[PDB]
């Protein structure tokens, strides 16, 4: 199977930048009969189905812009826009249209820049509702930070805890341009009352040190 | 036509 | 214009047999290819394989040969893919597409079918206050319910801005959310704020104050 590799796997630009995606190949896709090479792209919008742009490498389907501009040879390939616009903000992904089985590329993802935003992060102890039903569920939220790049971690008692973590992503706010998560740390009330302090932690590039927020049942 | 214009249609009889 | 009509979502039990449908319109149904095509949540495509409505002769990618089943129904320009012994790692979105003519790669895609793996039935959430230990956050944990969508509110509405709803995440066959909502600390715990959580399936709508906590 030919394997298609996409660099990289996400872009932050501005409205009217040029933008350039990488796809590379794990063999030559060039047709020496005709001299073509075999390669499509796509762009899915979010909740959309995938949209053909270009085929044979560098062809336009009818009704896509020319500022979408598909370049490249045997191994080596890119897609290129000249002007960025907002409704281009989307995932974009390249196929081998050389030999079955047909096989893409892992995607790359074009998102709005903007200036840094510190998150907002919120640590919320389980409700006496949920208690009283034996779970336990310590949530933590962080809200309106950019970039996305963020690491977040739950401290139990000093101690790190990675297990029973479930996460969650909003996408890039339609208004402000930034990201929010939320990260959930389920226990039992037999575990949670084991311990005291529990921590949620972030490490984000607006701050030079983690941001901290912690309880104590106490 | 079933033979689909691949540059190589590997696996199949349409050789 | 050529059309591939798919249903929006498909529910299927684990270890229980689906069977997806996509109805062909706008071209001749006979004569080209229908391809399967795999989005797991977050991840790429992956083709699955194709068949042909001409005489059902199908062709799938040798990872999904003992996965998925393709059929076709020329009475109804309808072609099919099963999926046998599916579990939570088969839920994703299948789109079936096109060839542009006889050209190896896809102009024309259906919406494409979500497919949700859970062996649940039809549960109500439970609905959990999330109090905090100048602005200040509050959250309310809608878990355990059965299946998408829930509706998250805030005091009605009035609070729009500043609030947070997050995709559910599926763990244990039933989905589990949560919302946030930021307000002035001036108006908590001063004010009274609520969460107006719906789900239609279950035809709930319950309503939870969030109240301090000593
Ligand atoms: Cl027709
Ligand atoms: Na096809």
Sequence with gaps: DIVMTQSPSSLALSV???????????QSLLNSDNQKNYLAWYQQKPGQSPKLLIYFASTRESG?????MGSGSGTDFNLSISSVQPEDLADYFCQQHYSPPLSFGAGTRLELKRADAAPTVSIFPPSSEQLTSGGASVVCFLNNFYPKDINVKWKIDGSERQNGVLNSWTDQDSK????????????????????NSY????????????IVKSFNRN | QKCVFFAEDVGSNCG | QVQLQQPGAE???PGSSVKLSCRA???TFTSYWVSWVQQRPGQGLEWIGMIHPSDGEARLNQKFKDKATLTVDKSSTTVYMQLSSPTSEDSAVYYCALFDGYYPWFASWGQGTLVTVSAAKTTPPSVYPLAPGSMVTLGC??????????TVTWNSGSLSSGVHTFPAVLQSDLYTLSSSVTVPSSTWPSETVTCN??????????????????
């Excluded at chain 1, 009217?16 to 794990?26: A, D, E, F, I």
């Excluded at chain 1, 990201?179 to 949670?192: P, W």
Aim: charged letters at 25%; glycine letters at 4%; proline letters at 7%.
């Design chain 3, 25 to 27: 319109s706008g071209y």
């Design chain 3, 141 to 150: 944990l809608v878990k355990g319910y059965f299946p998408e969508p829930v």
């Design chain 1, 199 to 210: 921590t949620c932690e972030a490490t984000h590039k607006t701050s030079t040190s983690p």
């Design chain 3, 197 to 214: 959580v719906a789900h239609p399936a279950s035809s709930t709508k319950v309503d939870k104050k969030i109240v301090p906590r000593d």
């Design chain 1, 176 to 195: 402000d341009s930034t990201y929010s998560m939320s990260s959930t740390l389920t226990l039992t009330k037999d575990e949670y009352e084991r311990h």
């Design chain 1, 16 to 26: 009217g930048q040029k933008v350039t995606m990488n796809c590379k190949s794990s």
């Design chain 1, 64 to 68: 896509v812009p020319d500022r979408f």
């Design chain 3, 11 to 13: 529910l299927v039990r």
